[PDB]
Design a protein around this ligand. Structure first.
Ligand SMILES: COc1ccc2c(Nc3c(Cl)cncc3Cl)cc(=O)oc2c1OC1CCCC1
Ligand SMILES: [Mg+2]
Ligand SMILES: [Zn+2]
Length: 345
C-alpha cells in the first residue's frame, strides 16, 4: 500500500485527489510536515486542490490521532472532504488552502519545545480540528458587511462574531452527514470538553477580540512558571486553553512570518478578496470599506502597518512565552517587514 495511508488500510490515495505521478513529489513535500517551512501551495497542487484533507490526514497519522480516538480512515476522509467542500473555492483568501495552512501551522506550534508534555491528546485534537474548521463556509466579506446588509446570520447572532459563530455551526453540523462522525468514539465527557475548547478557539479568531486576547497573553507571560529544563508549566485548564486560544490566533496570523515567497502569495489573495468585497459594496450602493478599494489601495504600506500594529506585537509576546523557540519566526517577520517597507512606492 501507499506510505500516505495507515499500514493495512484499504484507503486509496486517489480518493483524496493524489495521482501516482505526484505521490513522490507530495511525500517529499510532506517531509516538512512538522516544519514552519512547509509549502501548502505545493501540497495543493499535488492533490487536485484538496490541501486541507491532504494535510489533515498527514497530521492525524503523524500524531497517531486516528488510532488514539478510534477514527477509521473512511470516516475521517469522508468528513474532511465534506468540510473542504464547504470552503468556497471562489473566495480568494478564505478557501480550504487558508484552513490547511492554519491547521498545519497549528500542528507545528503544538510541538514547540517549550510546550512539550503540556497538552492532552484531546486538547491537541481540538486545536487542530478548530484550525481546520475555523473559516468554513466563509463568504468572502467581513462581519461588518454582514451586519450592514442585515444578513440573516447577523440577526441570528445579534451582530456578535457573526462569521465565527457560523463557522462553528457548520463545522459541527457536518459531523452529522453520512459517515462523517469522527468523534463517535470519544466518551460523552470528551465530546463535551472538546466542543467547549473548539468553540473557545474559533471565537478567538475574531479580530475584534485581538486586543483583549493579546493583553491576557502578556499577563500570562508575566507570571509564567517553567521547569528546570525550561518547559512551560500550565497547571490548570484555564492557562492551557488560553495558550491554545492564542496558538490558533497566531496560526491564523502567521502569513507574514513564513518565507517571503509564500507571504507574498498570501498577500495577493487577501487583497483580491478585499477587492471582491469592495466591488460587492459598490454594486449594493454601500460605502466602500477601507482597503477594499482597488483604486486607492496601498498594498505594501498596509502590510507594514499590519505587521507593526498586529502581527509583530502578537508574535513578540508568543516568542516571549516559548522563549527561545520562536526567535527564527521573529527574524523572518522582521526581514519580511523591511522588504515590504522597501517596496512602498
Ligand atoms: C497577509 O496579509 C493579511 C493576512 C490576513 C489578514 C487578516 N486575517 C483575518 C483574521 Cl486572522 C481573522 N479574521 C479576519 C481576517 Cl481577514 C486580518 C487583517 O486585518 O489583515 C490581514 C492581512 O493584511 C491585511 C491586508 C491589508 C492590510 C491588512
Ligand atoms: Mg475567520
Ligand atoms: Zn482565518
Amino acid at each position: 500500500s501507499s506510505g500516505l495511508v495507515p499500514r493495512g488500510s484499504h484507503m486509496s490515495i486517489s480518493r483524496f485527489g493524489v495521482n501516482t505521478e505526484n505521490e513522490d513529489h507530495l511525500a517529499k513535500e510532506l517531509e516538512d510536515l512538522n516544519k514552519w517551512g512547509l509549502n501548502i501551495f505545493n501540497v495543493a497542487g499535488y492533490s487536485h486542490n484538496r490541501p486541507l484533507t491532504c494535510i489533515m490526514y498527514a497530521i492525524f497519522q503523524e500524531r497517531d490521532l486516528l488510532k488514539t480516538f478510534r477514527i477509521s480512515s473512511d470516516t475521517f476522509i469522508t468528513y474532511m472532504m465534506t468540510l473542504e467542500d464547504h470552503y468556497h473555492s471562489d473566495v480568494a483568501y478564505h478557501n480550504s488552502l487558508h484552513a490547511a495552512d492554519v491547521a498545519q501551522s497549528t500542528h507545528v506550534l503544538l510541538s514547540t519545545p517549550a510546550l512539550d508534555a503540556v497538552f492532552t491528546d484531546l486538547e491537541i485534537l481540538a486545536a487542530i480540528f478548530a484550525a481546520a474548521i475555523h473559516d468554513v463556509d466563509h463568504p468572502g466579506v467581513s462581519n461588518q458587511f454582514l451586519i450592514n446588509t442585515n444578513s440573516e446570520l447577523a440577526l441570528m447572532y445579534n451582530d456578535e462574531s457573526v462569521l465565527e459563530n457560523h463557522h462553528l455551526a457548520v463545522g459541527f453540523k457536518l459531523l452529522q452527514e453520512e459517515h462523517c462522525d469522527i468523534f463517535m468514539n470519544l466518551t460523552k465527557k470528551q465530546r463535551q470538553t472538546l466542543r467547549k475548547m473548539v468553540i473557545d478557539m474559533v471565537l478567538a479568531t475574531d479580530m475584534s477580540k485581538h486586543m483583549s486576547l493579546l493583553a491576557d497573553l502578556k499577563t500570562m507571560v508575566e507570571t509564567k512558571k517553567v521547569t528546570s529544563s525550561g518547559v512551560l508549566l500550565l497547571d490548570n485548564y484555564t492557562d492551557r486553553i488560553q495558550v491554545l486560544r492564542n496558538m490558533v490566533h497566531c496560526a491564523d496570523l502567521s502569513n507574514p512570518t513564513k518565507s517571503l515567497e509564500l507571504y507574498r502569495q498570501w498577500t495577493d489573495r487577501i487583497m483580491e478578496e478585499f477587492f471582491q468585497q469592495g466591488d460587492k459594496e459598490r454594486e449594493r450602493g454601500m460605502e466602500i470599506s477601507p482597503m477594499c478599494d482597488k483604486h486607492t489601495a496601498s498594498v505594501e504600506k498596509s502590510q507594514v502597518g499590519f505587521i507593526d500594529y498586529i502581527v509583530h506585537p502578537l508574535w513578540e509576546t508568543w516568542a516571549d512565552l516559548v522563549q527561545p523557540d520562536a526567535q527564527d519566526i521573529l527574524d523572518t517577520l522582521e526581514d519580511n517587514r523591511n522588504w515590504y517597507q522597501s517596496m512602498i512606492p
